[PDB]
Amino acid sequence: PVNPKPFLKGLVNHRVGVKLKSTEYRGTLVSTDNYFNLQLNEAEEFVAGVSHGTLGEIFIRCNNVLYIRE
Amino acid sequence: VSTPELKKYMDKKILLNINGSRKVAGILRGYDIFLNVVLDDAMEINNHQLGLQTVIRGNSIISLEALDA
Amino acid sequence: MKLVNFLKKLRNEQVTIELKNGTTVWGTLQSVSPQMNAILTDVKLTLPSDNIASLQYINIRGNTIRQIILPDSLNLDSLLVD
Amino acid sequence: RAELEELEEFEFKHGPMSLINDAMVTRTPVIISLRNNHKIIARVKAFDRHCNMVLENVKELWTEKKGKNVINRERFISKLFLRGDSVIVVLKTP
Amino acid sequence: IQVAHSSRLANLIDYKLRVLTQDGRVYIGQLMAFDKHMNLVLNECIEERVPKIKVEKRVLGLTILRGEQILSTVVEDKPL
Amino acid sequence: EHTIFTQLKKNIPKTRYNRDYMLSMANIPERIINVGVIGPLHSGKTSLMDLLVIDSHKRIPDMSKNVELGWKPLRYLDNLKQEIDRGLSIKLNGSTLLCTDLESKSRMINFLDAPGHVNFMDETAVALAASDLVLIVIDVVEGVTFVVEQLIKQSIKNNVAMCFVINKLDRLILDLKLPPMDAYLKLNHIIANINSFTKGNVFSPIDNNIIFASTKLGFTFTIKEFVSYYYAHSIPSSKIDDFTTRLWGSVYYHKGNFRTKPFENVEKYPTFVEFILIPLYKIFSYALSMEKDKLKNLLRSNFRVNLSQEALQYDPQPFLKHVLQLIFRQQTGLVDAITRCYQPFELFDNKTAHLSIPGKSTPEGTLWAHVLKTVDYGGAEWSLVRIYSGLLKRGDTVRILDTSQSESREDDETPSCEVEEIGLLGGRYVYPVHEAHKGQIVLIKGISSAYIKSATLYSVKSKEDMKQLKFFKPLDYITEAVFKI
Amino acid sequence: GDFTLPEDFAPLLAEEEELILPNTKDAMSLYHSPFPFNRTKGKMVRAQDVALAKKWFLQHPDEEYPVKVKVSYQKLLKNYVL
Amino acid sequence: NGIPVKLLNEAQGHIVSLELTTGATYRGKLVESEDSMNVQLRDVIATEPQGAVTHMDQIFVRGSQIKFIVVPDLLKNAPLFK
Amino acid sequence: MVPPINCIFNFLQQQTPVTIWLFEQIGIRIKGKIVGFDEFMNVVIDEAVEIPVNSKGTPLGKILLKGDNITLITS
RNA sequence: CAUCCGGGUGUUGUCUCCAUCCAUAUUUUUUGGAACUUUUC
Ligand SMILES: Nc1nc2c(ncn2[C@@H]2O[C@H](COP(=O)(O)OP(=O)(O)OP(=O)(O)O)[C@@H](O)[C@H]2O)c(=O)[nH]1
Numbered sequence A: 001p002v003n004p005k006p007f008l009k010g011l012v013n014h015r016v017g018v019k020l021k022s023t024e025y026r027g028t029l030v031s032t033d034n035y036f037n038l039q040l041n042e043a044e045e046f047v048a049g050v051s052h053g054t055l056g057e058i059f060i061r062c063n064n065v066l067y068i069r070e
Numbered sequence B: 001v002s003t004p005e006l007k008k009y010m011d012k013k014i015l016l017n018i019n020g021s022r023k024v025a026g027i028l029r030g031y032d033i034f035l036n037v038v039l040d041d042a043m044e045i046n047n048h049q050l051g052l053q054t055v056i057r058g059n060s061i062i063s064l065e066a067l068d069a
Numbered sequence C: 001m002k003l004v005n006f007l008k009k010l011r012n013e014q015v016t017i018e019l020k021n022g023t024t025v026w027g028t029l030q031s032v033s034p035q036m037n038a039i040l041t042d043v044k045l046t047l048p049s050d051n052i053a054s055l056q057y058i059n060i061r062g063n064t065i066r067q068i069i070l071p072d073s074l075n076l077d078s079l080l081v082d
Numbered sequence D: 001r002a003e004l005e006e007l008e009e010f011e012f013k014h015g016p017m018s019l020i021n022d023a024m025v026t027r028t029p030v031i032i033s034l035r036n037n038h039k040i041i042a043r044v045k046a047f048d049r050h051c052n053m054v055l056e057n058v059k060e061l062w063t064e065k066k067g068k069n070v071i072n073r074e075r076f077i078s079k080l081f082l083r084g085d086s087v088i089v090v091l092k093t094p
Numbered sequence E: 001i002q003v004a005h006s007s008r009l010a011n012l013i014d015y016k017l018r019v020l021t022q023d024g025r026v027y028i029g030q031l032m033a034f035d036k037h038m039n040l041v042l043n044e045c046i047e048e049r050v051p052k053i054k055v056e057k058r059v060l061g062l063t064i065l066r067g068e069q070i071l072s073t074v075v076e077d078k079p080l
Numbered sequence F: 001e002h003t004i005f006t007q008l009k010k011n012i013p014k015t016r017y018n019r020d021y022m023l024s025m026a027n028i029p030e031r032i033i034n035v036g037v038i039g040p041l042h043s044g045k046t047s048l049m050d051l052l053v054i055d056s057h058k059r060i061p062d063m064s065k066n067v068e069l070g071w072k073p074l075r076y077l078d079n080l081k082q083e084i085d086r087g088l089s090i091k092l093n094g095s096t097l098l099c100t101d102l103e104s105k106s107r108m109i110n111f112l113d114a115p116g117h118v119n120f121m122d123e124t125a126v127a128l129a130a131s132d133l134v135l136i137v138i139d140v141v142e143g144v145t146f147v148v149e150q151l152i153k154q155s156i157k158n159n160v161a162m163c164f165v166i167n168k169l170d171r172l173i174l175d176l177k178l179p180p181m182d183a184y185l186k187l188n189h190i191i192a193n194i195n196s197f198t199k200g201n202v203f204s205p206i207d208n209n210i211i212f213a214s215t216k217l218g219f220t221f222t223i224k225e226f227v228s229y230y231y232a233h234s235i236p237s238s239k240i241d242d243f244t245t246r247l248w249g250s251v252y253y254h255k256g257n258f259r260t261k262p263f264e265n266v267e268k269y270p271t272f273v274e275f276i277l278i279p280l281y282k283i284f285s286y287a288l289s290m291e292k293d294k295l296k297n298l299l300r301s302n303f304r305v306n307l308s309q310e311a312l313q314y315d316p317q318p319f320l321k322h323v324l325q326l327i328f329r330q331q332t333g334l335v336d337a338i339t340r341c342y343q344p345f346e347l348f349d350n351k352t353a354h355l356s357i358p359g360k361s362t363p364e365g366t367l368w369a370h371v372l373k374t375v376d377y378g379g380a381e382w383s384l385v386r387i388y389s390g391l392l393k394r395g396d397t398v399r400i401l402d403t404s405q406s407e408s409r410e411d412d413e414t415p416s417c418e419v420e421e422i423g424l425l426g427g428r429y430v431y432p433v434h435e436a437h438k439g440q441i442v443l444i445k446g447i448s449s450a451y452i453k454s455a456t457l458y459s460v461k462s463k464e465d466m467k468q469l470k471f472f473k474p475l476d477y478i479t480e481a482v483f484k485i
Numbered sequence G: 001g002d003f004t005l006p007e008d009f010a011p012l013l014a015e016e017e018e019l020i021l022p023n024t025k026d027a028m029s030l031y032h033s034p035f036p037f038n039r040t041k042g043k044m045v046r047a048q049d050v051a052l053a054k055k056w057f058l059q060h061p062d063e064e065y066p067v068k069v070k071v072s073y074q075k076l077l078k079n080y081v082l
Numbered sequence H: 001n002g003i004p005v006k007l008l009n010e011a012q013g014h015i016v017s018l019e020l021t022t023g024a025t026y027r028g029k030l031v032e033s034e035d036s037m038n039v040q041l042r043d044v045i046a047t048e049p050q051g052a053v054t055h056m057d058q059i060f061v062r063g064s065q066i067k068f069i070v071v072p073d074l075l076k077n078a079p080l081f082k
Numbered sequence I: 001m002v003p004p005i006n007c008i009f010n011f012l013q014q015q016t017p018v019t020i021w022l023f024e025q026i027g028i029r030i031k032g033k034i035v036g037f038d039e040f041m042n043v044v045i046d047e048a049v050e051i052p053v054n055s056k057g058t059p060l061g062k063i064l065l066k067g068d069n070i071t072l073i074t075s
Numbered sequence J: 001c002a003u004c005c006g007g008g009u010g011u012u013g014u015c016u017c018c019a020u021c022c023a024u025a026u027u028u029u030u031u032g033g034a035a036c037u038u039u040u041c
C-alpha cells in the first residue's frame, strides 16, 4: 500500500539522513518535490559516519542522492 | 518510443554485461521500452547464483550478448 | 524564468569558460543554443599548470560547460527582463 | 506554457526550491558544494528549474595538490554563470 | 590554419573537423550530417589518441559519432 | 515492327537513384524483395507501374509532351506492338529499382507486372511462383468479382504475402458522384467484403494492408502516409501511433476529442470521412470550380504547396493530375505498406518448401535457382530466373533440369550450359550486370535450348551434396487449356 | 473516452465550408466531353478544318430513316475510311 | 529526425564497426538498429580495451553505452543525404 | 512476456527477500523487502540491510533507495 | 512515287504601341558517476 512519494510527504518536518554519489548527512526535512530534491534544517555532515560539520539550513540536489533514512 | 526488438532473444539464456565491469547470466522472460530486463535467475561471473528470478534496470546494461544462438 | 533566454541575450561577449574537465577557454561567444551549446570565436584553450593552445572557432557542447565566466561590465537586472 | 510556468513558480514557492528563491530575494551571501570539490561562496542573481545560477561577488574554494601535498587556494571572480549538474548541496550561513 | 566566421554548426556543413570526446580521443573528418543531439556523421574519419607520449593514429572511414561522448568540435581546414 | 524496345547503352534512362548504388543492395539478401502485381482487367496495374517508374527515372525518351501531362496514360511496361494495338497486357513484364521506404532507408524491389485478362492467368501463375508478395489491384467500381476471389485464393494458396490496392477512385466521384458519406460506406462494403475471403488475416486501412490510389490521376496514399505529411504538425509526436488507429472505424470527432459515441452532439461524420474523403472531395471540386487565385492561396495556407506560373494554366484534367501528384509525393506509402507487410521468416521457408521437396536447406556456395519462363525481349530471347541460393557468374557451366524430369528425383545426369549474359529486366530496356546474388530475379542468355517451360538450375561443388539437393516441381498453371485448334 | 487531442485541431481544409460550388456541377459536366470542349485551351484551326458533319455519320444509322439516307451513311463512311 | 540514425538504419546488413564507452570495439553485420542506437550485430568479433580479441555470435548493444560507429564507405555514395 | 512493472508489483504483493545491487558501486549491496512502487525504478524498502560484498553484515534501518542508482532485483 | 491547300518550334531582322520550427531537468544522448591518489614507461 505505501508508495514512495507519500512516504516522503509524511516524513516532512522529521529527521532524515542522505548518502551521495560519498558522504552521509543528517537533518530535519523541510519539504520535497516530484524530482526528489531536498531542503533540510540542522544539517550535519557525516563524513563516513563522522559528523565533520553542522551547516544548518541546506538544499540537496536530487541527482547526487543515494538513499533516505531515519 | 519504439520497442526494443528482443523477441528473438525471448526464452534464451543471455550474458547481460552490466555496469562496472560486471556480468549476469539467465534465461530471458521479459522487457520494456526502457530496456529493463526480466530474466529467470543465474550467476554473477568463480561463480555463485543469487535469486530465483531477477530484474535488471535499463541504464545498467552495457550489453546483452546471447549465450544460445 | 529561463536562464537560456539570458544566455541567448549575451552576444558577442569575450568570456572565459570552465568545463567539467576543468579546461579554461577564453573566447568571444558568437552564439549559444537553447541547450547551452556554446559557439565561440577568437578562442584560447588553457589547462588548470601547462602551456596554451589557441584556435579560431570552437563549438563546445552544453553538457560540458560547468561555469561560463561572464564579462567585467554587465547590467544583470536589465538582462533578466523578458 | 504560461500556466505551466506559473505552476512551476508556485511549486518552487511551496517546496524545496523555496529557500533558494528566498535567498535570491534577500541577496545574502551563500555557499554551494559542487561535484568537482569546489566550495562556491557567492551572491546569487538568477535561478531556474535546473538550479543553474548567475553569480556575483564570487569566491570559489578548492585545493590544487599533487600528492603528498597540502595547499588551500581560493580566487575572487566578479560575475560568473554556473551549471546545475555541478551543484550537490547549497547552504545559507546566517 | 584559417576559417570563416560562422553563426552555427549547420551552416558550416562538409568542413574538415577536429572533434574531442570525453575519453580523450580526437576524431578528425568532414561533417556530413548533424543532429538534434549533436551526433555527427564524418566522411573520412581518423581517430587520433594520445597514450600516457606521442600521437597514436587510426583511420576509421565513414563514422556515426554519438553526441553524448562529444566534448567540442574545431575546424581543421576548408572544404574539398 | 515486332516490339518497341530501346537498343543502345547511351539511351537507357538515367535513374536518379544511381543504379550502381542499387546493384550493391544485391549483396544483402534480406534487403531486396520481389513484388508481383496482379488483378483483373483494367484495374490499372500497368499504369501503376508507370507511376512508380516515371517517379524513379529522371528523363524518359518515351514521354511525348502529350502523355507527360497526359490525357493518354504512358504505359511503360507494355512493350509489345501487339499489346499496344490490342490495348491489353499480354506477356508479363517487370522492372527492378530501389526506392526509399517512409523511414528513408532504401530497398531494392523487383516488380513483376502480370496481365489481367482471365485467359492469361497462365502468366499470373508465374507472377505468383516468382514474387515474394503480391499486390492485388482492385477497381473500386467493379468491386471484387469472382476472379479477384481466385486471385486471393491463389495468393494464400502459394504462401505469398498480400497487399490490396483500391484503384480508380477518380471514377468514383468524377463519374458516379457519390455523396461524401456514401463513398465511405462503399469502402466499408469492399474492405469488409475482402476480409471475408481472407481467413487467417483481416485487412484494414489502419493496418496498412490497403492502399487508396488512383493511377490515371497518379496519386497513391495510405492513411499512415497522409497523416505523416499533414496531421503530424498539429499534434505532438507521441500521439501519432494513437491518432492513426483512431482514424478508421466508426469513431467520430467533436472538439479536440475522439468519441466513439453514436454520432450524438450535433455534426456527424466518421473520422475517416472527416479527415480524408471530405478534404479529398474538396481537393477535386476546388481544383475544378475554384478560381486559380483563391485556390492558389489555399494550397499554400494548408498543404504547404506552391504553384509555378506555368502550372496555373493547363485544363481541368492535366491541371488536376498535376495538383494531386504535387500534393501526394512520390509513392512512399506503397513502398512502405509493402515493406513491413512482408516477413521472410514465416513465408520464405514455406514457399521454398511448396515449390520443391520439403527439407532443411543445403545452404552453401553451390547455386540453386529456379528458371521460370523463357521471355522474349527485343534482342533475341532470354531466360527468366530467380536465385534461391548461390551466386551466378558470367561464363559458368551449369546443370539445367527440365521440371518434367523432376518426378524422376552418377554420370548421364548432366545437361549443362554456359551463362553468357546476365541482365536486369527494366521493361523498355535491359540493363547489363556482371553477376547476380541470392534472391533477385534476373535474365540469362544462352539457357534457352535446355528445356521447355520451367526448369531448374544448379551447380554443385561435391558429389555427395548433389544427392542431397532438391528440385522444383512442374509449375502449376491455373487454367487448363480447353480451347483446341 | 481515454484521451483527447488539443482543441483547434480540425481537418486541414475544414476552414472552407462548402464542398460543392455553383459551377462545379458544370465543371464535372465538361470533364467528360468529346474534344475542343474538355481542354479549355488550344490553338486556332482553319475554318474548313472543323468537321461538323463527321460525328453524325461515324455513329450508327439509327432506325426510322429510309434506305436513301442509310446509303448515304455508307457512302460517307467509305470516303472517310479511304 | 536524426540523419545519423537514418544512416545507421541504412547500414543494416553491412559490416559495421562499433566501440563503446568501455572501449571494447566490435565489428559485425548490423542486424537491427532503432532511433535510440540500440544495435544488434551478427558474426561479431570483440576486442578488449587492453588488446585481446574474442569471437561471438549475436551481440546486442544499447546506444547509451555506444561511443562511435564505423559504417562502410559505400553508403557515402547514396541516397540518404540527397 | 512478463514486464518489469508487473514483476515489481508481484514482488510487492509477496513481501520477499530482495537483494539490490548499486549502479557504479561494486563493494556495496542492499537486502530487504519491497514496500513501494513508482513510475520510475524508485521504490521504498523497509527493513533494509547494507552488505559489503565478498571480493559480513552491517546495521541499517528502513530506506527508500533511489531509482537511478538501482541495478539488480530478485523476489 | 509526286504535286497542292495548310502547320509547329528555334534564331535573327524589321514594323507598330508604350516607357527612359517545440517549450523545459527523474533509465538511450544536453542536468553527466565526476574526481582524488599511486605504480610502470
Ligand atoms: N478513371 C480511372 N481510369 C483508369 C485509372 N487507371 C487506369 N484507368 C483506365 O483503365 C484502363 C486500364 O488501365 P491500364 O493500367 O493501362 O490497364 P491494365 O492495368 O494494364 O489492364 P491489364 O492490361 O489487364 O493489366 C486504361 O485504359 C485507363 O484509361 C484510374 O486511376 N482512374
Ligand SMILES: [Mg+2]
Pocket (backbone or CB within 6 Å): F045, F046, F047, F088, F089, F114, F115, F116
Ligand atoms: Mg497491364
